[PDB]
A paper describes a structure:
AMPARs mediate fast excitatory signaling in the brain, and a change in their number or function underlies lasting forms of synaptic plasticity. AMPARs are homo- or heterotetrameric assemblies of the pore-forming subunits GluA1–4. The activation, deactivation, and desensitization of the receptor is controlled by ligand-binding domains (LBDs) which form a self-contained clamshell-like structure within each of the four subunits. Following glutamate binding, closure of the LBD clamshell around the agonist causes separation of the D2 domains, applying tension to linkers between the LBDs and the ion channel which opens the gate.
To test this, we introduced cysteines at sites on the central axis of the D2–D2 dimer interface, cross-linking of which has previously been shown to inhibit channel opening by trapping the receptor in desensitized-like states. Thus we compared S729C, cross-linking of which permits the relaxed dimer conformation, with G724C which we predicted would not accommodate the relaxed dimer conformation when cross-linked. To understand the molecular basis of this, we determined the crystal structure of cross-linked S729C ligand binding cores in apo-like conformations bound to the competitive antagonists NBQX (diffracted to 1.8 Å resolution) or ZK200775 (diffracted to 2.0 Å). AMPAR gating is driven by the separation of the D2-M3 linker regions following agonist binding. Thus, binding of glutamate is known to increase the distance between the α-carbons of Proline 632 pairs at the base of the D2 lobe of the GluA2 LBD. For the cross-linked S729C mutant LBD bound with NBQX (S729CNBQX) the Proline 632 separation was 22.8 Å (similar to that seen with S729CZK, 22.6 Å). This is less than the separation we calculate for the glutamate-bound mutant LBD (S729Cglu, 26.4 Å). Of the two LBD conformations we examined, only S729C, which can accommodate the relaxed dimer state when cross-linked, behaved in a manner resembling that of the wild-type desensitized channel. The fact that GluA2(R) S729C, co-expressed with auxiliary subunits and trapped in the relaxed dimer conformation by cross-linking, exhibited properties consistent with those of wild-type channels, demonstrates that this conformation does indeed mimic the behavior of the native desensitized receptor in the plasma membrane. By contrast, functional cross-linking of a different mutant GluA2(R) G724C/γ-2—which did not assume a relaxed LBD dimer when crystallized—trapped these receptors in a non-conducting state, indicating that this conformation must be distinct from that of native desensitized AMPARs. It is noteworthy that despite the constraint on LBD movement imposed by cross-linking at S729C, the current produced by cross-linked GluA2(R)/γ-2 was glutamate-dependent, suggesting agonist binding produces changes within the constrained LBD layer sufficient to influence the pore.
Residue numbers in the entry:
A (entry chain A): 4 to 262
B (entry chain B): 4 to 261
Write the structure that this text describes.
């Protein structure tokens, strides 16, 4: 009867509480997805146990081994009943798991150090004194590689052959590069993470311009789950009631540090 | 049995065949949503009758009367079983009907007359020689009114008080305005429609820049429908199989004129 929820340590979605070793079970954790899991569980009427994905991954098919890793793998291989995490809805994942309606929308966005004279992707594309880049792997890099929109193709042509490399290995590294680069590096990343960091001390970064594309995070269940329909209904209702917007404001802005 | 499908005459989703007068039933119509209805019906295993919505509307709640009009109304009040049309997924509609996963994604986009020196919303926002606007009502105007993104707020502040009015009553009026203005009017509208018109003679308009926001069209059923889940599974499968991409290319590009 107890539903196993797989999730991932990613701020502000799921974080260890400061006193987690004194605590046990679900009370060890806090965050946007901790709150959302409680609301989903209420609407669907189940008891649940939050469990952090063992490999700290979201989920992809290991191309060497054909085996799914991450939270997706935990669902496919029967170890968890539901994933409640910032897990991107993608076609390759939809082949092996089901997603709810998105509970959060997002897109590629521009992070600058405050004071940088950049307002848009167009601004970046037409210049070079301010370097700009993405994660060295993953879907943000791929969006630019594949784009046939003129501005994003212009940007990809610059990034792919820029020296020294404008790509970074982790999000932390891209954010640190923005902060340390005295206005001469801009970093392309998820709007949600960009907005979160804009509310973190030292309050020296800023999101500029509109989002470049459209994606969503969804609640995932194994195919054939007795839960898929109730979960989708719960996301719909929570969205309609403003609960998702309330949780976003809680974890990004009420708990933000930059006013 | 026989599922009543409500839809709307909107190119290239649903159109009268040139020879519709000789024809009857579903065979009078052609288009992306006609083909999609046939595929959904196949995957779900039902026979169906296509019917054009009586009042020619998508669906809104008459704020005076509480009564839903359009295809949404036909679902809510039991006159149709499923809507297969370019019907936007919105929260106020989700309160009274169910939507599938989106079968088409779209967003606000910029139409220019070819030769116009504009590539982006930022380009429009920084000048005035080229007027630009939206429909006089609806969600594109609301997007600009409500936006807190600097560039779109700048565009709204310009549009709301621009003289003469930059707004238009119909999309036909906006496209004709672009075409007749020798490059001094640009029109903000749905990317899907912009892309369609770009492939139509006289081949004098163009979509520039990326989309400004994110929306979707979905298949709609009344709440509690025995069809909602099968319809959703069918959209998922048709998307995964590439059929939706194939139909888009058919009606926008294989059948394009440019
Ligand atoms: N700190 S980060 O820039 O944004 C970030 C960087 C890189 C990959 C991310 C990711 C985030 N995220 O928002 O938490 C979620 C997420 N979800 C997935 O499903 C996936 O495959 N990859 C990711
Ligand atoms: N520029 S337009 O593009 O010709 C167009 C103009 C105005 C409203 C539209 C609309 C389209 N469309 O794509 O067909 C679909 C649609 N669907 C709805 O549900 C709704 O409420 N309003 C609309």
């Amino acid at each position: 009867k107890t539903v196993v929820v797989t999730t991932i340590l990613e701020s502000p979605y799921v974080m260890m509480k400061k006193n987690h070793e004194m605590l046990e079970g679900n009370e060890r954790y806090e965050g946007y997805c901790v709150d959302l899991a409680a609301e989903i569980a209420k609407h669907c009427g189940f008891k649940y146990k939050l469990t952090i994905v063992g490999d700290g991954k979201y989920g992809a098919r290991d191309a060497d081994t054909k085996i799914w890793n991450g939270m997706v793998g935990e669902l496919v291989y029967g170890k968890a009943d539901i994933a409640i995490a910032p897990l991107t809805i993608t076609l390759v994942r939809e082949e092996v798991i089901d997603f709810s309606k998105p509970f959060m929308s997002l897109g590629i966005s521009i992070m600058i150090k405050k004071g940088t004279p950049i307002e848009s992707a167009e601004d970046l594309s037409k210049q070079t004194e301010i370097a700009y880049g993405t994660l060295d792997s993953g879907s943000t890099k791929e969006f630019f590689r594949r784009s046939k929109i003129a501005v994003f193709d212009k940007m990809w042509t610059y990034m792919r052959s820029a020296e020294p490399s404008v790509f970074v290995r982790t999000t932390a590294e891209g954010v640190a590069r923005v902060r340390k680069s005295k206005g001469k590096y801009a970093y392309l990343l998820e709007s949600t993470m960009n907005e979160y960091i804009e509310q973190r001390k030292p309050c020296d970064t800023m999101k500029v311009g509109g989002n470049l594309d459209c994606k969503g995070y969804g609640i995932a269940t194994p195919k054939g789950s007795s839960l898929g329909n109730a979960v989708n209904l719960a996301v719909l209702k929570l969205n309609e009631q403003g609960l998702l917007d309330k949780l976003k404001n809680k974890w990004w802005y009420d708990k933000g540090e930059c006013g």
